[PDB]
Structure 1
Amino acid sequence: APDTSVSNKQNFSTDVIYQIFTDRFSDGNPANNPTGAAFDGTCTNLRLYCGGDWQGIINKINDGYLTGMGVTAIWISQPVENIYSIINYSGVNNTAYHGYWARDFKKTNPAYGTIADFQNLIAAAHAKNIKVIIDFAPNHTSPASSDQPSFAENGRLYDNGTLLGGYTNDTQNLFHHNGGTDFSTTENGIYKNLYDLADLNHNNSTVDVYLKDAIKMWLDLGIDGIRMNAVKHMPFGWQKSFMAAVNNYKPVFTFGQWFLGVNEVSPENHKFANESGMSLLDFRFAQKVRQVFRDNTDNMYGLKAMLEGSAADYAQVDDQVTFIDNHDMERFHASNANRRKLEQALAFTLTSRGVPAIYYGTEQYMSGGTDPDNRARIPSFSTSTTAYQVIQKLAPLRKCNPAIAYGSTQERWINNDVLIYERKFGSNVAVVAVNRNLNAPASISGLVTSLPQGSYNDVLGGLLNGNTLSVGSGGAASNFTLAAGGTAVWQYTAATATPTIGHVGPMMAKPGVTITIDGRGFGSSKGTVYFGTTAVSGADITSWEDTQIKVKIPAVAGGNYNIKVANAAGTASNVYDNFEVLSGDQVSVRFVVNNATTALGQNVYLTGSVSELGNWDPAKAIGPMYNQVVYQYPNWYYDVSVPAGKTIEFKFLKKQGSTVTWEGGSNHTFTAPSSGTATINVNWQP
């Protein structure tokens, strides 16, 4: 199959995700509706169950609503079993309608449906070329009070019906008991509870194994991707081990939720996306989009800076999931606002780099404030809205024009209100023009592009007041008027002669695992695959076609390798960096160093004899380590993904910037567990 096939679970760049709040989409099976005080059929009480379910989604998939829009992927509420409690908050009744209050990761939420219902959903979707993504929140269970066990379900955790433990009397330490987070620091947000939710302790062996076993179940059920909840609130090392588990079994496209506020640019966030084994929801993109197109707090210059900065900050920018709003933000469309604002933002997102995600109902001009006002029941299934049509015309471009899916981004024309950008991949090109100024047209002269000579019709058909583009030799466009609030899309596709890599997935795994390499001009005959300088050919290359290659990772030493391919004739392609070859199966180990004093601004890091520990290279050391919550300074701790059953040598370091102070004496030594977790505790050697 080609790169665009529904079967491609490793790449979503050619797709368009539709974010569904299951309960608020469509109640296709009233028989499974919750009853009494936990339900409101009218969906007037936004905190109770409204009845939306999997059967409903199936119906919507079957009746053309999503397909007619060009949607090729869906992201649904967490499917696992949630508590049944009806909680009274501020005099208001609340339910688990959102799917975030888990009780059993190996069962389904009966309100959504049964396992059989789930299987059917998967089948229905696939039959319509729609990939299925599930929300997964292994960071906590549900609302609890250690002092008052009768409150809710006491964050109880079950294993396929078998009780493991609750928040009260947590002798095994399945959960964290450090109060609630205040988001003052990263460490703080990880080792403390979100709201009143029972925080899961991933260092607990039972929890580790269980969670890993659970995801396997869902993978076995046929999912195509995973949306990881609050990744900024779980230990990074643990998550890396989780991704390894997934990748070394059945790799699927995974992206996490790492919230960013307005004007917020985080290096920690970049690093996580670059080395965790998963990508992230593009908050930087989303926030900038709202500023420029919605709240008028920034202009095109800021939009361009975000695009350029992001492309450099993210090793795999094309893996970031873009959006303009979500279940945790106020709806993009303001009641009294000009609809063109939303239309423009949509078009921008659909034609930009990454993986676009659209929050259900956006296309219906839904308005609403923060939770739960942004989660009303979809008021219509009309295909006649302008927004619907915008998506309908642009979504498919992601499939047919690889420039949109894998291309670079380049500004071609700009002013306070206008932005004209170009996407390019091999012989493929796409040019988009946006004039956010709703009252003034712009006179466009001097525009230069990569489009061949000719005339180009607006892909939007003038829907957003766009126009035809005339390109002479040299890619120079003839003078034209860009209507007030105008938006136009011009594109070109053609055969690519030379092998071009547009995407690789997964990006982190152990030898023997099969990876997917997508792009154009690979040819039909098996060529050669390079991992760094190492060449792979023949048998290990499972399949080879023009747009996609399937190959087994070679048994090279653990480390980072750049990927390249060559056609059967020996022609090399571009290089796709940052591939991570693991040393083997991974386990999550907690490292604790005692009595490591430092000066303000100086932190402790971990280094060692394996790739996972940076192979003694301080620049690749793990950290900075933590010293407030679990353990207190001068004792430091950190959770790390290491190779199972291996004997590892390690040392600690103290660093100020890139300046490094090595721990004295001899190296510490330990043997990693074969499965489950472990905690290594030593004293800093002077």
Structure 2
Amino acid sequence: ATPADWRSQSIYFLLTDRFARTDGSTTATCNTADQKYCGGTWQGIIDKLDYIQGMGFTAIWITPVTAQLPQTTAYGDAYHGYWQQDIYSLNENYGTADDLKALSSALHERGMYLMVDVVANHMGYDGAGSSVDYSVFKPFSSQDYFHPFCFIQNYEDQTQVEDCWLGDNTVSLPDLDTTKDVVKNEWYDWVGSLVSNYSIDGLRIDTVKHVQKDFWPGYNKAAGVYCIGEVLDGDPAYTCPYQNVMDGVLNYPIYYPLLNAFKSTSGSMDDLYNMINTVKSDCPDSTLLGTFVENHDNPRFASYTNDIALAKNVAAFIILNDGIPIIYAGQEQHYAGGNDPANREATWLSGYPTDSELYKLIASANAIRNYAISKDTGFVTYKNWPIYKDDTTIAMRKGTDGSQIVTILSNKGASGDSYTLSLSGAGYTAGQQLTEVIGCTTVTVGSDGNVPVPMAGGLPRVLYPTEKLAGSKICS
């Protein structure tokens, strides 16, 4: 599916090993500190697609599928998919080629997309960089395919970031020489075949800053689908340029100030407001980036604060920002694990309740986004515009005039006082009736064109014209 196709999507990102087991248990042990396969599979995900679809998501992103190093290393098993050795086999822990194909079809049958995480940068090996037997790698079964062994020390030297190896002498990640034609040719061949074999709709590409930029166009082309790259850097001057070689990137620029704005009641609304504007202007296309505040490489949001209102506002932002919302499995159950491995908790241990507060909030937020898109072909290309901020508040506007979603977010938290925000710049017509679609309440624009927004318990407010809601199942 194309970049344009992907603009309208909303992604639930999950670790295949940690989302759903084949037997469907909600009690099977998964001690994250053990760093071992806990037994999630592709069949499991299939069985739990209603859970996922019930929150309004239209796609999933799953961790890599290629066959991994077999060992339990000092850092555990390759349960996460990022330590591959045979790219032409599948990781048997998750199922068979038939199961992965079944997952693709089940998603397609519900009108959903499959995104698959892929690594081009490295293989993985249990042991020191010097001890590597390159014959275990298929097809890269010689040292000739790799950069000389050295570790990345200096992250201000981009050449060294690209040419040296990630990992350490405990688990080394032999670095492919992606400057060689034979290496380019093999990966390009490989990614096209992967996509066609498994009917994959889009790719999330791991470790993109660790491969020289000229590698990526051929790879994005060979894939023939939207690719969104992980470029692990908050500076949009570093990260956004990668959009000149790949369709999109993960929104790490927005990540840091977004987290900071909502992780406590003294978070900076200003830094978030400014970065929205920076990315809107400076990045090639903010609407093909992936918005997130939680993943498997950083402490989860609730690790910073268990305030449910703060969690609700940050989730609402992720869904309503430019680009593709990305929610990481367990965020919706208010999971609070810290750095890897603590943030790879098993989703099944929650019992998958569909009435949890976050599940409901996410459902209502995706519900309005999905609906709005169905009525407004300009919604996804309209660049989210921040219209208001104060010390504890940010407001933003998205959608064609007359059909815009106006979102008001707060970091006052659950103890927040009640009061009325007089909101200017929302652009609704005087006396228009709006529905606040999270709490299903109605608001009437002033005769001065300001919107009197009732604020309470630090709760997020999401406004849309009530007339435009006619026929929908929203706020019935």
TM-score under structure 1 normalisation? 0.62
Matches of 2:447 and 2:200, distance apart in 1:
48
Q: Superposed, which structure 2 residues align to 1:627-666 within 5 Å?
A: none
CA separation of 1:204/1:8 partners in 2, compared to 1, >3 Å: closer, same or farther? closer
Does structure 1 conserve the Cα–Cα contact (< 8 Å) formed by 2:191 and 2:222?
no
CA separation of 1:24/1:428 partners in 2, compared to 1, >3 Å: closer, same or farther? same
Does structure 2 conserve the Cα–Cα contact (< 8 Å) formed by 1:178 and 1:191?
no
1:14 partner letter: S
Matches of 1:12 and 1:333, distance apart in 2:
28
Unaligned runs of 5+ in 1: 1-6, 31-39, 496-686
Deviation, structure 1 residue 88: 2.3
Name the structure 2 match of 1:488.
461
CA separation of 1:404/1:346 partners in 2, compared to 1, >3 Å: closer, same or farther? farther
51, 60, 77: which is aligned to 2:63? 77
381, 404, 419: which is aligned to 1:429? 404
Name the structure 2 match of 1:42.
29
Does structure 1 conserve the Cα–Cα contact (< 8 Å) formed by 2:236 and 2:283?
no
Matches of 1:343 and 1:488, distance apart in 2:
10
CA separation of 1:155/1:450 partners in 2, compared to 1, >3 Å: closer, same or farther? farther
Name the structure 1 match of 2:111.
129
Alignment of 1:96 onto 2:73: no
Matches of 1:179 and 1:28, distance apart in 2:
41
324, 347, 372: which is aligned to 1:355? 324
Q: Indicate the SS of the match to 1:290.
A: helix
2:160 partner letter: N
Q: Greater strand share, 1 or 2? A: 1
Name the structure 1 match of 2:201.
224
Does structure 2 conserve the Cα–Cα contact (< 8 Å) formed by 1:145 and 1:154?
no
CA separation of 1:136/1:155 partners in 2, compared to 1, >3 Å: closer, same or farther? farther
- Higher relative contact order, structure no. (Cα contacts within 8 Å, ≥ 6 residues apart): 2
Matches of 1:493 and 1:220, distance apart in 2:
43
Alignment of 1:307 onto 2:276: yes
Q: Greater helix share, 1 or 2? A: 2
Matches of 1:220 and 1:197, distance apart in 2:
27
Deviation, structure 1 residue 314: 1.1
Deviation, structure 1 residue 449: 2.2
Matches of 2:304 and 2:218, distance apart in 1:
45
465, 471, 496: which is aligned to 2:445? 471
Deviation, structure 1 residue 216: 1.3
**Alignment length (residue pairs):** 449
Alignment of 1:188 onto 2:170: no
CA separation of 1:146/1:14 partners in 2, compared to 1, >3 Å: closer, same or farther? closer
Q: Indicate the SS of the match to 2:98.
A: helix
Alignment of 1:108 onto 2:90: yes
CA separation of 1:408/1:494 partners in 2, compared to 1, >3 Å: closer, same or farther? farther
Unaligned runs of 5+ in 2: 469-476
Name the structure 1 match of 2:16.
22
Deviation, structure 1 residue 401: 1.2
1:471 partner letter: V
Highest Rg: 1 or 2? Answer: 1
Does structure 2 conserve the Cα–Cα contact (< 8 Å) formed by 1:435 and 1:441?
no
Q: Superposed, which structure 2 residues align to 1:232-631 within 5 Å?
A: 232-246=209-223, 251-260=224-233, 264-273=234-243, 275-295=244-264, 298-334=267-303, 337-378=306-347, 379-380=349-350, 381-402=352-373, 404-425=379-400, 427-438=402-413, 439-445=416-422, 447-452=424-429, 453-461=431-439, 467-472=441-446, 475-477=449-451, 479-492=452-465
Does structure 1 conserve the Cα–Cα contact (< 8 Å) formed by 2:266 and 2:392?
no
Q: Indicate the SS of the match to 1:52.
A: coil
Matches of 2:188 and 2:466, distance apart in 1:
43
Matches of 1:41 and 1:458, distance apart in 2:
40
Matches of 2:426 and 2:35, distance apart in 1:
51
Matches of 2:447 and 2:458, distance apart in 1:
29
Q: Indicate the SS of the match to 2:399.
A: strand
Q: Indicate the SS of the match to 1:66.
A: helix
Matches of 1:308 and 1:178, distance apart in 2:
42
Matches of 1:206 and 1:445, distance apart in 2:
62
Matches of 2:423 and 2:436, distance apart in 1:
19
Greater alpha carbon shift after TM alignment, 325-334 vs 413-422:
413-422
Say what the alpha-carbon RMSD is for the aligned residues. Answer: 2.3
Name the structure 1 match of 2:471.
none
Deviation, structure 1 residue 46: 3.8
Matches of 2:242 and 2:404, distance apart in 1:
31
Name the structure 2 match of 1:574.
none
Matches of 1:10 and 1:103, distance apart in 2:
34
Q: Indicate the SS of the match to 1:376.
A: coil
Name the structure 1 match of 2:183.
207
CA separation of 1:449/1:96 partners in 2, compared to 1, >3 Å: closer, same or farther? same
2:150 partner letter: G
CA separation of 1:334/1:297 partners in 2, compared to 1, >3 Å: closer, same or farther? same
CA separation of 1:141/1:487 partners in 2, compared to 1, >3 Å: closer, same or farther? same
Deviations 1:169-227 (A, max 9, x none): x2xx2111141112232222111111121001112333222111111112212100000
Matches of 2:466 and 2:88, distance apart in 1:
46
Matches of 1:117 and 1:131, distance apart in 2:
16
CA separation of 1:192/1:296 partners in 2, compared to 1, >3 Å: closer, same or farther? farther
Matches of 2:3 and 2:393, distance apart in 1:
37
Deviations 1:566-621 (A, max 9, x none): xxxxxxxxxxxxxxxxxxxxxxxxxxxxxxxxxxxxxxxxxxxxxxxxxxxxxxxx
Alignment of 1:12 onto 2:6: yes
Deviation, structure 1 residue 29: 5.8
Matches of 1:70 and 1:320, distance apart in 2:
19
TM-score under structure 2 normalisation? 0.88
